[PDB]
Amino acid sequence: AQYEDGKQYTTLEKPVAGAPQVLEFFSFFCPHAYQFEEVLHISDNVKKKLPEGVKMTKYHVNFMGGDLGKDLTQAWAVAMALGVEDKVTVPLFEGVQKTQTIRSASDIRDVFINAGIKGEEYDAAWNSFVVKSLVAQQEKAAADVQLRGVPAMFVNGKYQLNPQGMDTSNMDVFVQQYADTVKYLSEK
Amino acid sequence: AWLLMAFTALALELTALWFQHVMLLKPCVLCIYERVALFGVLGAALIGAIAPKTPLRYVAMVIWLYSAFRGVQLTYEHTMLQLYPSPFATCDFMVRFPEWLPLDKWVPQVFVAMPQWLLGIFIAYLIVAVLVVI
Ligand SMILES: COC1=C(OC)C(=O)C(CC=C(C)C)=C(C)C1=O
Ligand SMILES: [Zn+2]
């Protein structure tokens, strides 16, 4: 049928029970992926094809900048913890290269406040139980499906697409192709 | 013909494996790619092909072929991507290697305690594959 496994999605070896339906592991700094989410807004362009109403998820990774990597992970988790993930996402995403805030916790926090959110919320989340559970959940989530350190969106039990398997002749429509695989895996 | 590449392999094997020791580990992946390819092909050449300097003499062409193919593409890649940041591209570490094939990185790389220049050597060595044929 001209369509088969290998040049569409990578076949894992074991799924993760109880894991989110659609989860993306990305970094806040290091990958060229910066364009992936900042330019092609794939996580956003792709969410627009939500099939039947499947919920998406976003996770950060621990590599690079030892403490910084982990620190940004908490920050990301803190975002999910406040529920104000979308708003701070980009400002903080764009905050790395375009603002250069890669400093200490109190700094990384400062920009978080600047994202238009009140500190009273971030404070509790800095250590609260919810946040502790979330930071660990990342690593765990990634570890359950051995990442390595790359942007990849896995689907409920299903696997993530192969960016190098698809084509790169339509930077614009590319989202559609990127999005055609995800839709299929969701209910098929 | 064996000693011909062995001289550079002996020194290149070690030199390549030299300037990556106390200098401060500094591990990656793409790094291991050229290293496993660089060592694999240079070895496969002396270790075998580069030996019959008299018969069909053409077992090395296949070995050299792979050297650059990977070399050129391991040199002319991530590097260009670096000034032209692209979505599909990202960061990484170690990198898997099915079909058993012991350690591979868990040792060849970690077994120790600006690479931009490295790009030119492989790109150059590329033509060596053809001339050496005789
Ligand atoms: C891109 O990957 C590589 C490096 O980067 C960390 C190296 O330093 C080195 C070794 C560096 C010198 C100066 C011999 C190699 C061989 C390499 O493939
Ligand atoms: Zn834009």
Swiss-Prot record, chain A:
Pfam families: DSBA. GO terms for molecular function: protein disulfide isomerase activity; protein-disulfide reductase activity. Disruption phenotype: Induction of the PhoP/PhoQ two-component regulatory system, suppressed by 50 uM CuSO(4). Disulfide bonds join C30-A33. GO terms for biological process: cellular response to antibiotic. Residues 1-131 form the Thioredoxin domain. GO terms for cellular component: outer membrane-bounded periplasmic space. Keywords: Disulfide bond, Periplasm, Redox-active center, Signal. It comes from the Bacteria. Belongs to the thioredoxin family. DsbA subfamily. Required for disulfide bond formation in some periplasmic proteins such as PhoA or OmpA. Acts by transferring its disulfide bond to other proteins and is reduced in the process. DsbA is reoxidized by DsbB. Required for pilus biogenesis. PhoP-regulated transcription is redox-sensitive, being activated when the periplasm becomes more reducing (deletion of dsbA/dsbB, treatment with dithiothreitol). MgrB acts between DsbA/DsbB and PhoP/PhoQ in this pathway. NCBIfam families: PRK10954.1. This is Thiol:disulfide interchange protein DsbA. It comes from Escherichia coli (strain K12).
Swiss-Prot record, chain B:
It is a multi-pass membrane protein. Residues 53-58 are cytoplasmic. It is found in: Cell inner membrane. The chain crosses the membrane at residues 2-18, 37-52, 59-76, 117-134. Signal peptide: none annotated. Keywords: Cell inner membrane, Cell membrane, Chaperone, Disulfide bond, Electron transport, Membrane, Oxidoreductase, Redox-active center, Transmembrane, Transmembrane helix, Transport. GO terms for cellular component: plasma membrane. Belongs to the DsbB family. This is Disulfide bond formation protein B. It comes from Escherichia coli (strain K12). The lineage of its organism: Bacteria, Pseudomonadati, Pseudomonadota, Gammaproteobacteria, Enterobacterales. The chain holds residues 14 to 162 of 176 of the full protein.
